[PDB]
Paper text:
The C-type mannose receptor and its homolog Endo180 (or uPARAP, for urokinase plasminogen activator receptor-associated protein) mediate the endocytic uptake of collagen by macrophages and fibroblasts. The large extracellular region of each of these receptors consists of an N-terminal ricin B-like domain, followed by a fibronectin type II (FN2) domain and eight (MR, Endo180, PLA2R) or ten (DEC-205) C-type lectin (CTL) domains. Here, we present the crystal and solution structures of domains 1–4 (D1-4) of Endo180 and a mutational analysis of collagen binding. The Endo180 D1-4 region adopts an L-shaped structure with a short arm (∼60 Å length) consisting of the ricin-like and FN2 domains, and a longer arm (∼80 Å length) consisting of the two CTL domains.
We obtained two crystal forms of the natively glycosylated D1-4 region, one of which diffracted to 2.5 Å resolution and allowed the structure to be determined. The overall structure of Endo180 D1-4 is the same in both crystal forms (the root-mean-square deviations [rmsd] between the four crystallographically independent copies range from 1.2 to 1.4 Å) and only the high-resolution structure is described in the following.
Residue numbers in the entry: 40 to 98, 105 to 137, 155 to 364, 380 to 507
The structure:
Amino acid sequence: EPNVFLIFSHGLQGCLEAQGGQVRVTPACNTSLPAQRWKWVSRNRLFNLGTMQCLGTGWASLGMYECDREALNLRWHCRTLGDQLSLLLGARSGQWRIYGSEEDLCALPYHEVYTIQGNSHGKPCTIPFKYDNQWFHGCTSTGREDGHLWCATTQDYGKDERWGFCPIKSNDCETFWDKDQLTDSCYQFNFQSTLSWREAWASCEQQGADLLSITEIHEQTYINGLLTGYSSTLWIGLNDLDTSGGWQWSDNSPLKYLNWESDQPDNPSEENCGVIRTESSGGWQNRDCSIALPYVCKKKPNVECEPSWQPFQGHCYRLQAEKRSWQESKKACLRGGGDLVSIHSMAELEFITKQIKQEVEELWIGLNDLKLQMNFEWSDGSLVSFTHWHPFEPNNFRDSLEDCVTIWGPEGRWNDSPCNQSLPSICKKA
């Protein structure tokens, strides 16, 4: 019902129809009628709800045939379909569009829907498929008692007995999820499935979810945690993929907590997607995004300033041209009754970079990991709600221990560097 649509011709002023094995175009289009209702399916086949059959011709013997029929041509490219109909039917501006909205017929293609459990290793729903000589164009609950929506991963479940569960967008977390009662976070460890990162990213999105994000040390300890006793290597949605940026979370979460393996990450150019390993007791490694590994999903239900200080929104900001270590830079802020600058918004980053930093190369900012290594916090106890690393940053967490963060160049993105280094700094108080 969501991605089912009606084909329409302006040149012929009528929608496509199917009757038995013959195709007619009728000017009076009613969405109520299923014989006029179509949807895209696998193998570039076009599926009809009313007839529960596919459109095809012969290698101009056009009509409607069973999808299983291999000897005919049942394949259609949406981008040419409009042009083809005009040829085989004569719709002699004269273009073919979706009935409701003037959208191309490629507006709602068939998305591979990835399974979750079952003897099928996450393999996508084969649509259509045949159980007990009945054609299905989606997931059905018939053949179960628990009522859970399931589908097959082959042309014939009677012959192959290959099945899987269906993804369900929801705001509860039951049967398919474990729940952390401290944070209302629901996690899903798909040990058996084997999908790419891009494929896995999809399978999570399909469930009103996304790939894992470990934003706090508590999350890692909890997960460490649920992995206990098991053997696997799982995708986590830690990517290097933003060409113009460093590491980030697939859910645009702030990268404040790290748990890389000792000699990791190596090959940040070829291996752009991160994984969690049980063997390292929760440690992170980066691998090739093309490889097929299990994955983990995560979802959550439901001013007048001082004289030398320029203002932005709630707070006042000032530049210290004097060069110092990170720590001695923070002290000079205290002497001013403020702390090292803290950034919580992109707007705040632009101002600080455009108005305050100006044409100075590098600057210390409030971010560090001195309290606990690998866990970054702002100096003024502010929440880390924003992360804007430069490409392949951060990288100095295992080499320096006392790892501190700087703004670098015009763009305003960040490098991490030992607090050894002497640079200018920016202060912020209200």
